[PDB]
Structure 1
């Protein structure tokens, strides 16, 4: 336990904490294969389930 604890304390560094906000409509539009508009496909798939 002291071996593993000392290894954790020697190998622990701070961070690089990156938040990436991803809009799925952009990914569905830039799909480059059967790409679509999300707001129309949702009402299409809801009214035609």
Structure 2
């Protein structure tokens, strides 16, 4: 346990925390293979489930 704690303290470093915002409208619109707009396909699939 002390060997593992020593290796943890010698290998733990800080970070680089990054948030990334992903909108599914941009992903589904720029997918280049059966790409679609989200707002009309959701009402197509909800009004006909």
- The Cα shift of 1:22 comes to 0.4
* Structure 1: gaps of 5 or more residues: none
Q: CA RMSD in A?
A: 0.3
Q: Which residue of 1 aligns with 2:37?
A: 37
TM-score by length of 2: 0.98
Task: Provide runs of 4+ in structure 1 moved above 4 Å.
Answer: none
- The Cα shift of 1:28 comes to 0.2
Output the CA distance in 2 between the equivalents of 1:5 and 1:22. Answer: 37
Figure out how many residues of one structure are paired with residues of the other and give that number. 49
TM-score by length of 1: 0.98
* Cα deviation digits, residues 20-45 of structure 1 (max 9, x gap): 00000000000000000100000000
